[PDB]
Amino acid sequence: SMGPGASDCRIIRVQMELGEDGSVYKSILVTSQDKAPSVISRVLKKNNRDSAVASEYELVQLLPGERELTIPASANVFYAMDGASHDFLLRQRRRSSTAT
């Protein structure tokens, strides 16, 4: 398409397991090459955290049929996300270390 608003970035909503504090849903910017671990770092610091290694968490996209599409590390969220919902979440991942 054509139009003056040719910008290539967008903003998504991201929750966390906070519970009491309510659904975070913070406005997180998404660039053309924003990979999962880059976006996670922004979400973590938006949660008033001492924001930690993104490798300890995983990026998740919410889908309208009550499903979850988990975005892997080497995928640009901007293209990895299905694009059916601008809503996402972040959760601590339990998976091991740097064994070669």
From Swiss-Prot:
Please list the residue ranges annotated as the Ras-associating domain. 8-95
Its domain of life reads Eukaryota
Q: Share what the entry says about its subunit structure, partners included.
A: Interacts with SAMD9.
Q: What does this protein do?
A: Probable guanine nucleotide exchange factor. Putative effector of Ras and/or Rap. Associates with the GTP-bound form of Rap 1A and H-Ras in vitro.
Q: What is the protein name stated in its UniProt record?
A: Ral guanine nucleotide dissociation stimulator-like 2
